[PDB]
């Protein structure tokens, strides 16, 4: 999540998929898993990745100022693209609250911790219909917390 800064100096545009012919992609309000629907490339998964110091912090852009955060739905909290209506306030480091992620990249594939140290846990749906999921339990036969990390187009 960066408001331009230096001109022509590397935009951090990020995309996520997996080697079993599966991809992450936004339709209206959620990043769908594996392979649902994409008729003539009307999706655009490019998000700006900003780190605290060792890779972990937050995500933002998806067309025009949509911030990927751990949002509060009363008692529950899931991954959401909230519309940020301010170009001046953009966090470089930030403290532990329901808004960051620990990106645990084990060489070619990662996992997403939520809030940051406490909060919610790293997975995504297995087949072509449900989305990205910050769950209540680890990988004890649950979902896909082993997904490949790709940059730009």
UniProtKB/Swiss-Prot annotation:
One of its GO terms (molecular function) is interleukin-1, type II receptor binding. The keyword Signal applies. Disulfide bonds join 67-117. The intracellular form of IL1RN is predominantly expressed in epithelial cells. GO terms for biological process: acute-phase response; immune response; inflammatory response; insulin secretion; lipid metabolic process; negative regulation of heterotypic cell-cell adhesion; negative regulation of interleukin-1-mediated signaling pathway; response to glucocorticoid. GO terms for cellular component: centrosome; cytosol; extracellular exosome; extracellular space; nucleoplasm; plasma membrane. SUPFAM superfamilies: Cytokine. It is linked to Microvascular complications of diabetes 4: Pathological conditions that develop in numerous tissues and organs as a consequence of diabetes mellitus. They include diabetic retinopathy, diabetic nephropathy leading to end-stage renal disease, and diabetic neuropathy. Diabetic retinopathy remains the major cause of new-onset blindness among diabetic adults. It is characterized by vascular permeability and increased tissue ischemia and angiogenesis. PANTHER family: INTERLEUKIN-1 FAMILY MEMBER, INTERLEUKIN-1 RECEPTOR ANTAGONIST PROTEIN. Belongs to the IL-1 family. This is Interleukin-1 receptor antagonist protein. It comes from Homo sapiens (Human). The gene is IL1RN.
């Amino acid at each position: 999540m960066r408001p331009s800064g230096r001109k022509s100096s590397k935009m951090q545009a990020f995309r996520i998929w997996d080697v079993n012919q599966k991809t992450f992609y936004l339709r209206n309000n959620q990043l769908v898993a594996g392979y649902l629907q994409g008729p003539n490339v009307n999706l655009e998964e490019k998000i700006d990745v900003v780190p605290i110091e060792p890779h972990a912090l937050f995500l933002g852009i998806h067309g025009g100022k949509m911030c990927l955060s751990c949002v509060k739905s009363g008692d529950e909290t899931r991954l959401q693209l909230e519309a940020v209506n301010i170009t001046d306030l953009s966090e470089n480091r930030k403290q532990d609250k329901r808004f960051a992620f620990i990106r645990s990249d084990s060489g070619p594939t990662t996992s997403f911790e939520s809030a940051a140290c406490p909060g919610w846990f790293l997975c995504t749906a297995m087949e072509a219909d449900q989305p990205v999921s910050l769950t209540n339990m680890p990988d004890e036969g649950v979902m896909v917390t082993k997904f490949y990390f790709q940059e730009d187009e």
